[PDB]
Amino acid sequence: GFSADHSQIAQTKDTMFTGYLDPVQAKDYFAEAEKTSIVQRVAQKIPMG
Amino acid sequence: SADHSQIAQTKDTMFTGYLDPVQAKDYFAEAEKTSIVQRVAQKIPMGATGIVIPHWTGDVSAQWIGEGDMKPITKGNMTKRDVHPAKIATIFVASAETVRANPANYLGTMRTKVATAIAMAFDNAALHGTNAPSAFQGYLDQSNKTQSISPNAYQGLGVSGLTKLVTDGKKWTHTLLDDTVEPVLNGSVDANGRPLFVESTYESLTTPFREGRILGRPTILSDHVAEGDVVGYAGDFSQIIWGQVGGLSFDVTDQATLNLGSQESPNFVSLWQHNLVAVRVEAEYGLLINDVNAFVKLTFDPVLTTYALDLDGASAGNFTLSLDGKTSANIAYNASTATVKSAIVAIDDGVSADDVTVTGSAGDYTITVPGTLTADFSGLTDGEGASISVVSVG
Amino acid sequence: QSISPNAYQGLGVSGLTKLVTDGKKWTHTLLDDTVEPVLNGSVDANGRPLFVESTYESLTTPFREGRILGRPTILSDHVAEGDVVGYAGDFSQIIWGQVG
Amino acid sequence: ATGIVIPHWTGDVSAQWIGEGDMKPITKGNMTKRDVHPAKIATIFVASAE
Amino acid sequence: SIDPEKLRDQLLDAFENKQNELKSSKAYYDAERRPDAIGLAVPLDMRKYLAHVGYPRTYVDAIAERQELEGFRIPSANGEEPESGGENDPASELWDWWQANNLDIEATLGHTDALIYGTAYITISMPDPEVDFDVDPEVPLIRVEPPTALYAEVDPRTRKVLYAIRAIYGADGNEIVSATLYLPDTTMTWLRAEGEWEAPTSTPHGLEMVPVIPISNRTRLSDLYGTSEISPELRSVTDAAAQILMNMQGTANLMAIPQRLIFGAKPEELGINAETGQRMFDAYMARILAFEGGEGAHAEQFSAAELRNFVDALDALDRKAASYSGLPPQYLSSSSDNPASAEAIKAAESRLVKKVERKNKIFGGAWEQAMRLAYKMVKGGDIPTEYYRMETVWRDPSTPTYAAKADAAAKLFANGAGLIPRERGWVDMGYTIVEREQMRQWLEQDQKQG
Amino acid sequence: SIDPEKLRDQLLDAFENKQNELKSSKAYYDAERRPDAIGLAVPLDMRKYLAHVGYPRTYVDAIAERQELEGFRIPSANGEEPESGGENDPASELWDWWQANNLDIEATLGHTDALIYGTAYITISMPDPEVDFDVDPEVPLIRVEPPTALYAEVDPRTRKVLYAIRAIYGADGNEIVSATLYLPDTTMTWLRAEGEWEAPTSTPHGLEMVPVIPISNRTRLSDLYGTSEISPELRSVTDAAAQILMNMQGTANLMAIPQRLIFGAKPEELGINAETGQRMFDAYMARILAFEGGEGAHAEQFSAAELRNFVDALDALDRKAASYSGLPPQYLSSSSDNPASAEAIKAAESRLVKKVERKNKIFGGAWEQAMRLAYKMVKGGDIPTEYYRMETVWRDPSTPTYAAKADAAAKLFANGAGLIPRERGWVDMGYTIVEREQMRQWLEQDQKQG
Amino acid sequence: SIDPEKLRDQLLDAFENKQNELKSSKAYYDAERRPDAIGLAVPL
């Protein structure tokens, strides 16, 4: 190939294009689901003050 | 132009009798190999800039407090990763006389064959390391877990293998099997010698090979998953993302010039001045396996696993090993191959010096062991790239 | 390979292994009707037959010209010769023609 | 009666990962053919006109 | 089912493979530089002067203009005579769509491509008025597309189109700037807007058929796909005559003039300049040359080549090209006649006329089918029974002969007392469905406005 | 009875044994390369330039493009409305079926295949609406198919078909992608041959007879299958003319130029470059070449071949091709006297007209048979007694000499006083059954207006 | 849309380029000199 900022040829490697071609944000494809108490699922709830 | 050319085409010997009325189709044609990775993994919207995947990391917290005991302070946290698409390409070239004649539809044949080769080049760079571009992140052969399936596939997958996933807190969501696996399913029998995975009169295919479920998980077949020791995979296939920047693209010309040698050993030829016609092909792909540890390699018989281990030139502190989740003693930053060997063989699970092998030098080791080996570098005090990974060789 | 002790472990396991190890398919099996005894006599370790169901009224499934492990069976009175009593493999590898 | 001939494809075609500005590789697909010819089988049987 | 993303690339491959066949037939119509046309006796430095033969263009152009759609006929309930009013003759609604689409231009072009390549395609849609067409929005937008820009996979079983793509190479060069995909259920389309295909626009049609109909030049049932009108025997006499013209042109430079020699004379005694090998005297007419000649010297000449010996072959080839094509004899060469009488005209034309009758019927089948599609698509519901019994109708392919026709039709009609009803006189005189409707009004006026 | 699994594979064998000989008949009409067509005097490296000839296509087109079917006529014993134009009348229903299938197009192609190959097959079904056909589903679906796609074993005794198969024969490559087997009580389709045959799907039908009927080019009664119309003489005169055309062409590239020779000079005496075997010459027209010419040098020429010596033969092959085929002499020669008058046209066409009229008589018997069989499909039962006597009608094969007929009919009819009824005048003017039944309406309008 | 001045320069280029096709057809209608017309037997 060529050096970054090779003097004769413009490439997406070149320093002059920093601040452009930045990678787009995305939603978190690996996001874990949030946890919820197992004890509150099985145990009897009672009124309390 | 040359003739019988090793790269071009010039009414070459391939096309002997092309015009003859006695030439029929290839009655023995073999169907095209698709990618399977592009069929099992989640396709993501992708572009020439690449993409950023954000992830949460902070251990947000609360404490129990007595009346009037003044409350604790806490802070969240989050992080960034990014993926850039790599590019794959080829050119093919023929005399204009070959393009005029189009013998055996060679041009149309060639377009569809290179399309399969580009798909397989992606696929073989994801299931294995083969010629993979620098911009892909991970490949499944790195996974550091193995399972023999051969004596009984049910004990292999659903019990022995599945244990290795759930112990690390990893899910099992799919399994992917090569065609060569089938005899082990047919040979998986109960103690009375009746097969497990098929109904009583043995008329039909065993259920995983109908693409049926095993233990609630779907089964995916392939003609071309197996390489070296490995016949298939199991794991959390939701951990894989891939994407593509626009279609498989063809451009064509006779005007241009080609180098028939390397960039440093040039041998240029004009397409125009010889009346050759050439086709450019390109595609552009991204891949990320979010956790290489979330899979199990499937093998017929049991096998040893080989690890490369590097200490980043750290000249102080002691690391430690853990094998199938059982810890060794602590080990010095410059320990000999024999000192690492004895420190591994000392692990209480029953490893022995006829199975364990170690080779290399101080801070740079290869280890062979019958299990899931891991290492902790937190006790080193002079380097931070210190790491361990699986390696595979011819 | 020999189907004599137990036809299932023959055809579907040891036999198929020696095809898929070369990457070659199994798509049909051709048997001589002299194979009928060893199919009828193919049993589990309890000595009950493999292919045919309770009270043994029916003709045995492959000899009903049924498929086994998905692949069609095909039968004749005249394919046995010496030690050989049938073939299993990819019969799509055979082509033939007649000129008038 | 002149038989038949059939092609087959043998071209191990290939494509390579490349960096921006790198040299594209060049590839050629390849082929072979087989011919097949028929054969006669015969007999004659003979009887008196009576 | 099929994923349209892969199906785009899958059918573009077939489309671009087809172009390598069609560029053979095009080279005969466009008179391009074929290899086999280059006449062999011409020396290598003179082979720059290509000679071209017009026969393929002459034949295709003589067929293509002689066919014009005159109208549609659709049978009424009980076989009744139609009328133009409220609850219209369906003959005029289809004609209105035809005229509003300018199809009398698009079809007279598109039939030429159907003769050259053996096929062409008719495409139907409701218009997209949000694209600013300058077209009536309440007419099914019907257009013709050539096989240089559209391809369709045809079912072996039913012969219906399975799927099709229109793909446009850009204004520069040969790179696809857009593709439009015709599924049975839906049309969808992509732009290669900046170097790769943008996300697809889509539009459902819900029909049982793809909205693309192939016109095809079928000669014979065993031609399943249609084939070029520029046939192998017409190609053969074209290329053979191109070689003869080439050799005759070369002969007319090198050989048509006798070459003069002198023998025995010693070059230095003629005063030939040894610096060049040439001395040239004044060529003015009656000057006698005197030569020493003492060596027993004398003059000799190589004769001219007789150019007539090629013209005898050029005539034999024109006479053969007339036989294969059925063009009336005077179209390829002057001959024994230039038809003197209305009979002598209709005699010579008969090959060409009966050939065009076949082209009207075979293209009529596709146009009828495209109008059934356009109705089913614009009005919804289902096609009324009579449209399955529709006929296209076309102007008489023969030369107009009006002044010899009038005496016949007037003598049959005999001022209403005669053999035929007035309306059949108007039909035999050849006035179109439109021109007869105009006369129906002028005749009504002429009974009042006396 | 025979198992249809076995019968299928028996019938693909018989079918493919036919295809191998049908290749020969195709090769003349498509004008493909033939071993016997290559002109021998051409040197082997120049023999790659073929030179095809149009005689056999010209004869088959001139027949097939002259035929058109008109409305069937059914007789009616004691007929109450024997004109048969009313909505109840049986001659109309067969024309609804003819129109709705567009047999007005399909038959025109199917008659070409019946002449090229000697046969074509009519095939009949009720339409399955499960296939979404472009048809009104109460009409019987009729098609005609080439002998390259359908084969049918005729019983020698009855001349009935015993059973038949249609092979749909793939996209390209002899893959029999689907097949339809016709038996007396049932039609079956072996749905696909995708890697292997699918299981069959079957439709029963009430006929005692298979729903397939042969069009056959019956030359003579002693032929019971039908023969190609490209007859052996016309094959041989085509292959004869191909060689003459090719030898004439080769002569023009090699030998229509007289070669110039010089005898009595050593090359170095001429200053010929001995290392390369030639020297350049300034060829400009007036220049005189002086040769030193010692020891009696002189110039000679080999003569040019006279290309007219082949044109003297090509006219004889054209003259024989006309006389064998019976075409008008201006279809081959392109030079013979153009018919100046209506009588001269009537004479010159006469053998072609009688040939076409005989072909109409032979092919009528196939459609006539097919319509009888289609009646038992739609209106189940035995056929009404009148249809066994039905006739096809056909356009007159001669060129439409309208102005001559138009005077003649007026003179016969004499404004209703004359020799013939009005209806006969219309018939002798040649108007179709459809156009007459429309003229019958227009005549009421001209009586009613006063 | 595009800046009128930039667009003007692009179109005047395309226009002034296109002339090299057109001037070939003019040479047949106006009967200009063209090199393929010149007969070869005539001396220079």
Automatic annotation (TrEMBL), chain C:
It is found in: Virion. Its main location: virion. Keywords: Virion. The keyword Cell wall biogenesis/degradation does not apply. GO terms for cellular component: virion component. The lineage of its organism: Viruses, Duplodnaviria, Heunggongvirae, Uroviricota, Caudoviricetes. It comes from Mycobacterium phage Bxb1. This is Major capsid protein.
From TrEMBL, chains E, F:
It holds the Pfam family SPP1_portal. It comes from the Viruses. InterPro entries: Portal_protein_SPP1_Gp6-like. This is Portal protein. The gene is 11.
